[PDB]
Amino acid sequence: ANEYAVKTSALEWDVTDIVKNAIIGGISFIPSVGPAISFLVGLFWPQSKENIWEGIVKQIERMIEESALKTIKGILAGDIAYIQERMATVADLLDKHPGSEEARSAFNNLAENIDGYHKKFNNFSDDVNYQILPMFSTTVMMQITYWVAGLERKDEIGLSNIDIEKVRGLIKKTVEQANSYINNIYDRELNDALNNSTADTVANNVMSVHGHCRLHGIEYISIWDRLSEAESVNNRIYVDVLSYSTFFDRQTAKARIQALTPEKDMTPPLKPALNGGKRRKIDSLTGHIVRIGGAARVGGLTVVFDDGSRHQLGTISSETSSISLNGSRITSLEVWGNGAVDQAVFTLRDGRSLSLGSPGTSRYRKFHVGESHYIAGIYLSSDYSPLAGQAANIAVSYQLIN
Numbered sequence: 001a002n003e004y005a006v007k008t009s010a011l012e013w014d015v016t017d018i019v020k021n022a023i024i025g026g027i028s029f030i031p032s033v034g035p036a037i038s039f040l041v042g043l044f045w046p047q048s049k050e051n052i053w054e055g056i057v058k059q060i061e062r063m064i065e066e067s068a069l070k071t072i073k074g075i076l077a078g079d080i081a082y083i084q085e086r087m088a089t090v091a092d093l094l095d096k097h098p099g100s101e102e103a104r105s106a107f108n109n110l111a112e113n114i115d116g117y118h119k120k121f122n123n124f125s126d127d128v129n130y131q132i133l134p135m136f137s138t139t140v141m142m143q144i145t146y147w148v149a150g151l152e153r154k155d156e157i158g159l160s161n162i163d164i165e166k167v168r169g170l171i172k173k174t175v176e177q178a179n180s181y182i183n184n185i186y187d188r189e190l191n192d193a194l195n196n197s198t199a200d201t202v203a204n205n206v207m208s209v210h211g212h213c214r215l216h217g218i219e220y221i222s223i224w225d226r227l228s229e230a231e232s233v234n235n236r237i238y239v240d241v242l243s244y245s246t247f248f249d250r251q252t253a254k255a256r257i258q259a260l261t262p263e264k265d266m267t268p269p270l271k272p273a274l275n276g277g278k279r280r281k282i283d284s285l286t287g288h289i290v291r292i293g294g295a296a297r298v299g300g301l302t303v304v305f306d307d308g309s310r311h312q313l314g315t316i317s318s319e320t321s322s323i324s325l326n327g328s329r330i331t332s333l334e335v336w337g338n339g340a341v342d343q344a345v346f347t348l349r350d351g352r353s354l355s356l357g358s359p360g361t362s363r364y365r366k367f368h369v370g371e372s373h374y375i376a377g378i379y380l381s382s383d384y385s386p387l388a389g390q391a392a393n394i395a396v397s398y399q400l401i402n
Contacts, residue, residue: 004196006208007127008063012245012398014215014370015055016138019043021372023145023223024237025402033153034095036233037107040149041091044142045084053080056134068128072135075120083117086110087146099158107150108163114143115170122181130185134216140178144224145233147171152232168231175228179221186213194260203259204246207395210263215243215369219400239400240279242271242376247393248365249337254381255393269303269311270379271397279376279399280305284324285346287356288317290389298341298357298391301380314382315389323354330375332368333396336361341380341391349374373398 014020022043030036045051050058053076061069090110093103121136122129129136150157151167159167190213193205219241226237242263247255258270272279283304290299300314302322328350336343336359343357367375377397384392 002196003198004193004201004205006193006205007131008208008212009060010246011366012211012215012243012369013059014134014373015059016052016134016141017370017372017400019052019138019141020219020223020400021402023141023227023233024239024400026234026236027149028234032095032098033150033156034091034093034098036149036153037087037091037094037146040142040145041084041087043145044138045088051076051080051084052138053135056132056138060131060134064128064131068124071124072121072132079117079120083110083114083142086113094157098156101158104157104159104163107157108159108166111147111150111167111170114146115174118143118174118178126185126188130189130212133182133185133212137178137182137216137220140174141220141224143174144171144227147174148227148231149233152234171228171231175224178224182213182217182221186217189213199256200251203251203256206259207244207246210244211246214241214263215373215398219243236402238277240274240277242279242397242399243369243373244270245367245396245398247379247395248335249341249363250339250384250387250392252381252383252392254383255379255395258379258395268305268309268377269313270377270395272305272377272399273307275307280307281327282306282325282330282376282378283308284322285354285378286320286322287344287354288315289319289321289357290315290317291319292360292388292390295360296358297360298344298380298394299382299389300391301344301356301378301394303378313378313380314391317389321354321356323348323352326350328352329401331371332366333375333378333394334364334366335394336364338363339392340384340387341394344394346375367396369398372400372402374401 090106118139197205286302288300303311328348332347334345338361342360345355347353375396376399380394
């Protein structure tokens, strides 16, 4: 009816992160179009594994209404299966006979037939559409990468000017439709969570929408936007879009202030600032430990960025332990707590870790999206007097980095 309730996963995940990483790194090492198309096939339909669509379904199916889920699985069983076989066939024909009419016809025919597959994953109810957004965005990326890879290598395929202009129109129309669609459902869901949540739930309800739509939509757009402009899959792309987590484990007024800030106006330390087109890196972290009944607990956190800017979060203490990131990125944050932050463990890519506090519970929550998403910002607050200085919540922002 009215009171908003989160419709997606409580935690943040990405099944398409291997695809995104390979794309933003480019495939300049693959000169031939045949191997280039085969390399794409290996991303979306990995050998001897489930494809990306099936992997997304396994993550979200527990939340999908049954009749909609049966329709979705039928699409994967038929349409998605046909594309794998056809694209593999097109890749082999381009490999064996690079300039032949047989291979070019197969590419152009497949280029036409994949037009509109993205609409198969936004033809449901508004709620199911929102839930399967990663399925829509994955299908769009499959379309754009196939079209652009062939268009970039149009001389090796032998495309005519009519073929070239047709593929261009497909890329342009599809990117505009996807950007329009993703931003439309993002804006609607964010407004629903902002105005129809209670005071006790609005912070995590809003952050959840930001996380879902930016990790499974906005950061996608940043990738294929560059792909369509350059008409190339050979360039190294930097994605400055951030996605977000919810607050663990008690929402406070300071957390609400952050969550209710428009994403474009969010400040450090939760959202790292832009410098020269790059998001600033975290230079060091200083944890502040408070004693609650003799036990070590997280009280506060100091975040220093590579520009020297310092950000004090939570309670200042005389018991501290720090770590210098030395240019390495935070791959995971693990927190134990029940109504508060008992212990927090930051793990860096280089193997080092910083552990703060001690667990007073088994209740646990991991901030970790995958191998190509890194914690780029942190927020923490202790504005809950019953906790007597102990941190009440913590949240992070993720960035896709090659």
